Design a protein around this ligand. Sequence first.
Ligand SMILES: *[B]1(O[C]C2=[C][C]=C(C([N])=[N+])[C]=[C]2)O[C][C]O1
Ligand SMILES: [Ca+2]
Length: 223
Amino acid sequence: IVGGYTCAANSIPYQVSLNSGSHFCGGSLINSQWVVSAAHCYKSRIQVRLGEHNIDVLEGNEQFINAAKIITHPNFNGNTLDNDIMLIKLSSPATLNSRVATVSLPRSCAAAGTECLISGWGNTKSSGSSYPSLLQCLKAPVLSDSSCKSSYPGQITGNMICVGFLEGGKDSCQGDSGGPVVCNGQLQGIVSWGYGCAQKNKPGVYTKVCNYVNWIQQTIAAN
Ligand SMILES: *[B]1(O[C]C2=[C][C]=C(C([N])=[N+])[C]=[C]2)O[C][C]O1
Ligand SMILES: [Ca+2]
């Protein structure tokens, strides 16, 4: 997260880290057994780390639960990042408390201008790299599908939303991929792609979660 602030510890209780020896993507807890993330974050072994703030220090809220099942969207395109969504079933249910909670799935798509909260342990610099220990947060509005298309001509499917600041300086970045964008208490985005990070006219592009409610609830019911 570039141009953010450090979240209050555990104020984002649905944020997970996906760990493959180290943090490589984010994800969101949507059921005691299920995390949603981006299909481009797929690996055959993932340990899910819940209740993190400092991913470099054990603070005693952490639950480390390996993935039992990892299901990419059947139509995920590795090239255009269309349908950039996957589900991860945990090998045991996460205990839900104040520090580990679910986030609702959307009941409608969000309007342009809706304030959202974006989080992760991705890079914090627009120039070079600094990967933080502490979970970063960013308040950011949903952008118009028109404004998102003008930023990226012919690259935005209907399964994509822009969220951010056309001016630059405030965006997610590499290592936030797969993590949440939550607006009015609903998971509306998954950190997907962008041309660099926090550049002028290149806002973050996010998978549009309100297109996928049927697919998610089906995969859960079947597995
Ligand atoms: B991600 O990184 C991809 C990424 C995430 C966010 C932006 C952005 N908002 N400008 C750009 C690229 O995927 C694999 C590792 O983290
Ligand atoms: Ca920790």
